[PDB]
């Protein structure tokens, strides 16, 4: 991993980008010549090769973290998968040439970058990536870090350990999928159950669910089971409480928390996706990407709106990029 050539290394690039806050299919616009980010000395330039979609990257856009926000414009999307060109002088873990990924942004409603992933190029920290496991795919890898950095984070956050119950508020979607997969093969959970409507409970008893719930036909929180941790997902921490063990645990990642439930927003970081190396290379531990994905770089707005509608399956990611 030398150096590449600094001429081969682009100053203006490809990328989605908006100007002003607001709906995504009213403020994000294509530019064909948006400037590339330069890097600090702890950062590497990737070469996205994909990049996922989340539902902070629209709530950004609306403008709801605008007071810690960066200046505006903004290049969205905090999921990449890509390709390492250059490394910062302080940079040790990483070789220009090493597969990658990560979610960009450490701290994700305060100063996420300007340079997000929907470009060709971006800039990352050393410490938010991780070595792309060999077998998944650019397009799996780009589906994982933030949905499974937050998954893993809120389970930790619970105290989930072996053997003890966990409900899932949300089973199908990009971070309840991993909430599942990881509750069962990772923290060793004796039981998961998991809502989700009709159509999706198949899914859910796959990735490791023993009790798929359909919230369409019945309220989790009048069952008689109560459970160690309860995991909201949607923004139901009202009905969580009625679910949990007492002495158990509730964590949401839609506020606002009602006690003793508690909000988090996780941190990113390249660690955690290290540490679920090799549940990642074993298949223990899977990519979930909804059958629409992946949407080319010229269907972004698409995309989002896709994501936007709250009924995706796993993943939306955009590849080529
Ligand atoms: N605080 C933090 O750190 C983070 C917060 N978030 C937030 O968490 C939430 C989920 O994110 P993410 O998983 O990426 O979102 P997705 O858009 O991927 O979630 C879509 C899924 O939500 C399911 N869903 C919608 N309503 C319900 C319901 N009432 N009960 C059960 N399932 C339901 C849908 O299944 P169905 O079609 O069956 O309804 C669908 O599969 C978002 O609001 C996001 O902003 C996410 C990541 C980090
Ligand atoms: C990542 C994240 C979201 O999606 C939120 O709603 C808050 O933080």
């Given at each position: 991993?030398?150096?590449?050539?600094?001429?081969?290394?682009?100053?203006?690039?490809?990328?989605w980008?908006?100007?002003?806050?607001?709906?995504?299919?009213?403020?994000?616009?294509?530019?064909?010549?948006?400037?590339?980010?330069?890097?600090?000395?702890?950062?590497?330039?990737?070469?996205?090769?994909?990049?996922?979609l989340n539902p902070v990257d629209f709530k950004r856009a609306?403008?709801?973290?605008?007071?810690?926000?960066?200046?505006?414009?903004?290049?969205?999307?905090?999921?990449?998968?890509?390709?390492?060109?250059?490394?910062?002088?302080?940079?040790?873990?990483?070789?220009?040439?090493?597969?990658?990924?990560?979610?960009?942004?450490?701290?994700?409603?305060?100063?996420?970058?300007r340079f997000g992933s929907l470009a060709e190029y971006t800039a990352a920290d050393e410490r938010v990536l991780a070595h792309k496991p060999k077998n998944l795919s650019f397009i799996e890898a780009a589906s994982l870090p933030l949905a499974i950095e937050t998954a893993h984070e809120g389970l930790e956050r619970?105290?989930?350990?072996?053997?003890?119950?966990?409900?899932?508020?949300?089973?199908?979607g990009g971070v309840g999928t991993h909430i599942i997969q990881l509750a069962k093969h990772v923290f060793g959970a004796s039981k998961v159950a998991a809502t989700a409507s009709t159509?999706?409970?198949?899914?859910?008893?796959?990735?490791?669910?023993?009790?798929?719930?359909?919230?369409?036909?019945?309220?989790?929180?009048?069952?008689?089971?109560?459970?160690?941790?309860?995991?909201?997902?949607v923004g139901e921490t009202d009905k969580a409480v009625?679910?949990?063990?007492?002495?158990?645990?509730?964590?949401?990642?839609?506020?606002?928390?009602?006690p003793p439930a508690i909000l988090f927003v996780l941190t990113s970081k390249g660690?955690?996706?290290?540490?679920?190396?090799?549940?990642?290379e074993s298949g223990?531990?899977?990519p979930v990407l909804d059958p629409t994905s992946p949407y080319p770089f010229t269907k972004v707005v698409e995309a989002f709106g896709y994501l936007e509608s709250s009924r995706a399956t796993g993943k939306v990611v955009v590849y080529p990029i």
């Open positions: 991993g030398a150096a590449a050539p600094s001429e081969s290394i682009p100053s203006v690039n490809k990328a980008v908006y100007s002003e806050y607001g709906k995504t299919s009213d403020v994000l616009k294509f530019d064909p010549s948006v400037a590339v980010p330069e890097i600090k000395e702890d950062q590497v330039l990737i070469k996205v090769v994909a990049a996922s609306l403008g709801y973290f605008k007071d810690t926000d960066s200046p505006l414009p903004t290049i969205p999307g905090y999921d990449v998968a890509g390709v390492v060109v250059k490394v910062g002088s302080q940079v040790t873990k990483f070789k220009v040439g090493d597969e990658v990924y990560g979610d960009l942004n450490e701290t994700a409603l305060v100063n996420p970058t619970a105290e989930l350990s072996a053997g003890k119950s966990v409900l899932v508020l949300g089973g199908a159509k999706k409970l198949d899914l859910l008893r796959t990735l490791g669910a023993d009790l798929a719930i359909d919230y369409t036909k019945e309220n989790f929180e009048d069952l008689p089971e109560k459970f160690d941790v309860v995991y909201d997902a009625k679910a949990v063990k007492e002495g158990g645990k509730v964590v949401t990642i839609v506020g606002p928390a009602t660690s955690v996706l290290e540490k679920l190396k090799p549940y990642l223990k531990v899977k």
